[PDB]
């Protein structure tokens, strides 16, 4: 009933999900000429040393690398956040062409892809309760450009053949998400939403300024995934991004001058 196809894409989502036209929808364009430095912000604290990855799943929209979130093993704190946010999964949004794929844009620039590390606020006890709160989630977004390979991505790329189609999963233990980060943790932040249905306005977005580089070969393998299930006509999993939504009555704040 929703997807990224010719007849169920983002421009249709409002019919089943009227919050698609809400006050705090994501993604947005980040205008670097209007975002303002906020000295009240603190450095990000990314604490992933104890992360436990479990599984990778093709959910028909993207793939999720899933983590054990039953303890404070991989947490995000600091920045704009109060309290402790646990990593539940990461996934990507990507294009059919190197000139599109990201959800956020920077001065209208689209990157080739965008990584989302999804975390929930432990004060709400579980993910499902967290998404019902305005401060329930924190998503760390990282842009991808095509250039050099990202070594820390390669283990993800090489499992993709095993989860080609919707509903397939594979064991994915002992993956270190630190290998997906850029050097700098400088960021922009603003209040927004999930970027897929149900589009809930429960996210503190934290979007890193510095992109990571991935190779053309790495991106090409993402583009071999399928939206469809096994034994169905092939629908390449590409262009699984929602375009920028109106900023409305929000301000984007920068952690850096």
Q: Please enumerate, by residue number, every residue annotated as part of a binding site for Zn(2+).
A: 91, 93, 116
Nearer to Ni ion, 217 or 230 (CB): 230
Q: Give the x-and-dash track for 1-40 against Ni ion (CB under 5 A).
A: x---------------------------------------
Based on the residue annotation, tell me whether 14 is a catalytic residue of this protein. no
The Cβ of residue 104 has, within 10 Å, a number of other Cβ atoms equal to 25
Q: How far is the CB of 93 from Ni ion (least distance, A)?
A: 6
Contact set for Ni ion, span 36-75 (CB under 5 A):
none
Q: Which of 60, 64, 84, 37 lies closest to 228, judged by CA?
A: 60
* Binding pattern for the stretch 85-124 against Ni ion, x by CB under 5 A and - elsewhere: -------------------------------x--------
Using CA atoms, how far residue 63 sits from 14, 56, 164, in Å, is 24, 7, 10
7, 14, 61, 104: the active-site residue: 61
- Residues annotated as binding site for substrate? 195-196
- β-bridge partners, 170: 56
Q: Which is nearer to Ni ion, 86 or 116 (CB)?
A: 116
- What's phi and psi for 49, nearest 5 deg? -60, -35
CA-closest candidate to residue 203, choices 100, 46, 39, 88: 88
Cβ 121 vs Cβ 158: under 8 Å:
no
Cβ closer to Ni ion: 1 or 257? 1
**Minimum distance from residue 26 beta carbon to Ni ion (Å):** 9
- Min CB(144)–Ni ion separation in Å: 13
Q: Cβ 39 to Ni ion, closest distance in Å?
A: 30
> Strand 53-58 relative to strand 63-67: parallel, antiparallel, unpaired?
antiparallel
Q: By C-alpha distance, which of 239, 217, 232, 245 is closest to 158? A: 217
- Residues 120-149 binding Ni ion (CB under 5 A) are none
113 SS3 class? strand
Which residues bind to Ni ion, rule: CB under 5 A? 1, 116
Which residue numbers are catalytic?
Answer: 61
């Amino acid at each position: 009933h929703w997807g990224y196809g010719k007849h169920n894409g983002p421009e249709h989502w409002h019919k089943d999900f009227p919050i698609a036209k809400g006050e705090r929808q994501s993604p947005v364009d980040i205008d670097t000429h209007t975002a303002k430095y906020d000295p009240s912000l603190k450095p990000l604290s990314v604490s992933y040393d104890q992360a436990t990855s479990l599984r990778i799943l093709n959910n028909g929209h993207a793939f999720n690398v899933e983590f054990d979130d039953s303890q404070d093993k991989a947490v995000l704190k600091g920045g704009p956040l109060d309290g402790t946010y646990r990593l539940i999964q990461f996934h990507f949004h990507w294009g059919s062409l190197d000139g599109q794929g990201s959800e956020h844009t920077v001065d209208k620039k689209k990157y080739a892809a965008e990584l989302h590390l999804v975390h929930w606020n432990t004060k709400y006890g579980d993910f499902g309760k967290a998404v019902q709160q305005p401060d329930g989630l924190a998503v760390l977004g990282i842009f991808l450009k095509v250039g050099s390979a990202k070594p820390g991505l390669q283990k993800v790329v090489d499992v993709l053949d095993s989860i080609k189609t919707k509903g397939k999963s594979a064991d994915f233990t002992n993956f270190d998400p630190r290998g997906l980060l850029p050097e700098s943790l400088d960021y922009w932040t603003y209040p927004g939403s999930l970027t897929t249905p149900p589009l809930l306005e429960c996210v503190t977005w934290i979007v890193l300024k510095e992109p990571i580089s991935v190779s053309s070969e790495q991106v090409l393998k993402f583009r071999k995934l399928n939206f469809n299930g096994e034994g169905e006509p092939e629908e390449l999993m590409v262009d699984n991004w929602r375009p920028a939504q109106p900023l409305k009555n929000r301000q984007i704040k920068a952690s850096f001058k």
